[PDB]
Amino acid sequence: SSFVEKMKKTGRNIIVFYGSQTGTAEEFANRLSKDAHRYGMRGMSADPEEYDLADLSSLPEIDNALVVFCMATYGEGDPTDNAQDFYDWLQETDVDLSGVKFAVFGLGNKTYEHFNAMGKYVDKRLEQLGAQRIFELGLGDDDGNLEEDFITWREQFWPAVCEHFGVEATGEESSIRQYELVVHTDIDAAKVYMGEMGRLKSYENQKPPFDAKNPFLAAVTTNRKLNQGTERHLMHLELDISDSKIRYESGDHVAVYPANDSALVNQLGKILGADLDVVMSLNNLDEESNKKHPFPCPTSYRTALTYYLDITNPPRTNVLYELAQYASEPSEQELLRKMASSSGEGKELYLSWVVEARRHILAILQDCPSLRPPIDHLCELLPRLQAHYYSIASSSKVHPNSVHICAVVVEYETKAGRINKGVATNWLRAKEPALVPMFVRKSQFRLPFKATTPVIMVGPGTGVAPFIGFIQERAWLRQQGKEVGETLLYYGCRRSDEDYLYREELAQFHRDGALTQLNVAFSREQSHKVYVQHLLKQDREHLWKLIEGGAHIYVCGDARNMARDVQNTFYDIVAELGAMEHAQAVDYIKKLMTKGRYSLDVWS
Ligand SMILES: Cc1cc2nc3c(=O)[nH]c(=O)nc-3n(C[C@H](O)[C@H](O)[C@H](O)COP(=O)(O)OP(=O)(O)OC[C@H]3O[C@@H](n4cnc5c(N)ncnc54)[C@H](O)[C@@H]3O)c2cc1C
Ligand SMILES: Cc1cc2nc3c(=O)[nH]c(=O)nc-3n(C[C@H](O)[C@H](O)[C@H](O)COP(=O)(O)O)c2cc1C
Ligand SMILES: [Ca+2]
């Protein structure tokens, strides 16, 4: 299957590939594909992995061929896994792509080292190869508002396509269902999905290998509150992976498929007067597509809203639009409709009423009571429930049959006056010591190859997680008689008497000599604030010495402000004691990252 041939046979001329890991690039690519119709074109969205991009040179065979790439960037400016083959292709190929027309929208996050590196590389590479850019590279920023970055970009993409191929707005704009409903009245239980992903019964009859499509149901053997206060809830979990064949190393991530709050799901059924226990199936009206269902079908609505659908984040604009038609009351519909406009008051109303106020789907149906959409249409609009990532807090050398998690429970109050709860954390929190569907995702965050190499670990708050495993492995290495270099932890929290994670464990590790140094910064213990970077600055002399000697630096935690301040402080350090300019120090540090001596495991 050549993607070009498939376009020819299904009559399409616009193909939008998506580089996606948590499914955002997918919806974006899907939304572009459906837009084609308004401009007299026929487009399709596709997963690059399922094809050979070297076929891009056969695109001229289709009249008015146009390829659009929605690419997301991951770990150290790399391609999502489904686009690794494509990336590999782009670097070794020197094929001539004259005649190919393209546009690229990258999904990125300014708070990461290589911002939108994938999108930038694809766009730059296609031009070098000869293709013709039909519109400027799009730079979505998940730190600002990705959605807005998208609709803004889209609004200027279509017109630009219209002007190049000589087409126009068919005017037409009638919401088209992508799936068709079918109720299953006479259905056996052995044929109904109860929340497993991929293969039916995969949860009950567990067989390896276990990965994202076949999660291992680990038993929760330990779940204890790590902090003293009751204002927040930091917890430590231990997951049994015995009999799973799963392997991991300190630094890797453990992902889990949670379930929504059962009461919130019930509230939804009640505000839609829908019997959630009705088994059903949603079939793709495009018989030639691979996505026969938006999620494992057949399955009840309850199972769908609890295990396969994201009903907690703020809905994207295109979702608020389709739902407007179910708003009888004049003023409520008004509200919803505009919320999709590019800019104007509509952008502002969306950011304020939906995003800032953090209104989820229920919250909306509650603040627009006239709005009574059918449960099956909603089930098609909403995004999939994603796996959630946590930095493994254990060393496989010490706990080969157990994966540890250190996490803070997300719970806060919204402007709208509701109590918002985090899906995975509240779900994990209610797990009594009983199963969690998980899988390990390999990372590049790793202890030095040589045990004698020093390590500087900077992890405030839950950022301390991967380091708990690092410390265990380093203590275990001293025990096996190996010589180990210095091991310093720069931890931080608010008050030694409230959120000091693993206080006794770390204190004990230090007493034993495993932890060479334990430096904690309490940000709210005195007048002003003490952060990890301040302690890092004070130790400039020693850190420089270790750094000049070949030490490995690790930073884990808040990506927004922490990661950048800690890095700014390491800049100053190298600049002050390295006898060089700031800009040379920035170079210095950035070189360490490429040598693998300054590793980052940051999130937000
Ligand atoms: C590679 C990686 C590693 C990670 N490692 C860890 C780890 O070791 N430990 C850990 O605890 N977490 C970690 N995280 C964060 C973790 O994956 C989840 O995002 C977190 O546990 C929250 O999930 P949730 O499902 O409970 O929240 P969700 O339901 O997904 O909700 C989260 C969203 O709620 C919003 N939010 C949170 N607090 C507020 C507030 N006061 N006001 C307004 N909005 C708010 C934010 O917009 C946030 O994006 C990691 C993330 C990545 C990508
Ligand atoms: C582990 C991880 C690593 C990331 N690395 C980068 C990065 O290097 N550069 C960047 O611009 N954005 C980075 N991001 C942000 C994503 O690119 C952004 O959230 C995007 O919307 C994800 O798209 P997806 O849902 O389609 O996979 C990262 C996100 C995660 C969870
Ligand atoms: Ca010290």
Provide the residue ranges of all domains of the chain, joining segments of one domain with +: 1-174, 205-258+385-445, 259-384, 446-604
Question: Ligand 1: distance of its center to the CA of 425 in Å?
Answer: 8
Contacts of 584 (CB under 8 A, 6+ apart): 575, 578
Q: What is the largest CA-CA distance in the chain?
A: 78
Q: Is the peptide bond before 298 cis (omega within 30 degrees of 0)?
A: yes
Say if 1-174 and 446-604 have the same CATH topology. Answer: yes
Among 225, 217, 200, CA closest to 498: 225
Q: How many C-beta neighbours within 10 Å does residue 278 have?
A: 14
Of the ligands numbered here, which is closest to the C-alpha atom of 602? Answer: 1
Among 426, 434, 433, CA closest to 261: 426
Contacts of 572 (CB under 8 A, 6+ apart): 537, 540, 582, 585
CB 389 less than 6 A from any atom of ligand 1: yes
Question: Ligand 1: distance of its center to the CA of 386 in Å?
Answer: 12
Question: Ligand 3: distance of its center to the CA of 539 in Å?
Answer: 7
Q: What is the CATH number of domain 259-384?
A: 1.20.990.10
Backbone angles phi, psi at 280, to 5 degrees: -155, 175
Among 241, 200, 244, 192, CA closest to 221: 241
Backbone angles phi, psi at 580, to 5 degrees: -160, 170
Q: Which residue has tokens 């904690």?
A: 520
Which residues are catalytically annotated? 391, 556, 601, 603
Instruction: Tell me which residues have their CB closer than 6 angstroms to ligand 2.
Output: 20-25, 72-75, 77, 80, 107-109, 112, 114-117, 142, 146
Of the ligands numbered here, which is closest to the C-alpha atom of 534? Answer: 3
Question: Ligand 3: distance of its center to the CA of 71 in Å?
Answer: 44
CATH topology of domain 205-258+385-445: Elongation Factor Tu (Ef-tu); domain 3 (2.40.30)
* Helix intervals (H) in 373-456: 375-381, 423-429
Strands 411-413 and 419-421: antiparallel
Contacts of 383 (CB under 8 A, 6+ apart): 23, 27, 309, 310, 313, 316
- Interhelix angle 317-324/330-338, rounded to 10 degrees, is 150
CB 253 less than 6 A from any atom of ligand 1: yes
Q: Which atom of ligand 2 is nearest to the CA of 146?
A: 21
Resolution (A): 2.4
Task: Please tell me the distance from the alpha carbon of residue 43 to that of residue 454, in angstroms, as a whole number.
Answer: 54
Q: What is the CATH number of domain 1-174?
A: 3.40.50.360
Of the ligands numbered here, which is closest to the C-alpha atom of 510? Answer: 3
Question: Ligand 2: distance of its center to the CA of 314 in Å?
Answer: 18
Which H or E run includes 332? helix 330-338
> Atom 26 (ligand 1): residue with closest C-alpha?
422
Task: Please tell me the distance from the alpha carbon of residue 470 to that of residue 464, in angstroms, as a whole number.
Answer: 10
Question: Ligand 1: distance of its center to the CA of 602 in Å?
Answer: 12
Task: Please tell me the distance from the alpha carbon of residue 279 to that of residue 187, in angstroms, as a whole number.
Answer: 8
Backbone angles phi, psi at 220, to 5 degrees: -85, 105
CB 533 less than 6 A from any atom of ligand 1: no
Task: Determine the residue type at 8.
Answer: K
Backbone angles phi, psi at 568, to 5 degrees: -65, -35
CB 391 less than 6 A from any atom of ligand 1: yes
> What are the CA-CA distances from residue 491 to residues 20, 68, 206, 291 (Å)?
33, 44, 39, 46
Q: Which atom of ligand 1 is nearest to the CA of 426?
A: 26
User: Which mutation among 73, 425, 444 tests ligand 1's pocket best, with the greatest number of atoms within 8 A of CB?
Assistant: 425
Among 47, 132, 107, 109, CA closest to 82: 47
> How is domain 446-604 classified at the architecture level of CATH?
3-Layer(aba) Sandwich (3.40)
User: Ligand 3 (ion): which residues have CB within 5 A?
Assistant: 519
CB 443 less than 6 A from any atom of ligand 1: no
Q: Rg of the chain over CA atoms, in angstroms? A: 26
| Per-position b or e across 518-551, b if 16+ CB within 10 A of its CB | bebbbbeeeeeebbbbbbbeebbeebbebbeeeb
> Atom 5 (ligand 2): residue with closest C-alpha?
74
Q: Is the peptide bond before 159 cis (omega within 30 degrees of 0)?
A: no
Of the ligands numbered here, which is closest to the C-alpha atom of 312? Answer: 1
> Atom 6 (ligand 1): residue with closest C-alpha?
390
Q: Tell me how many helices (H) and strands (E) the chain has.
A: 19, 23
Task: Please tell me the distance from the alpha carbon of residue 14 to that of residue 32, in angstroms, as a whole number.
Answer: 9
| DSSP-assigned letters across all residues of 68-122 | EEEEEEETTTEE-GGGHHHHHHHHH-----TT-EEEEEEEE-TTSSSTTHHHHHH
- Interhelix angle 117-129/84-92, rounded to 10 degrees, is 40
DSSP state of 208: S
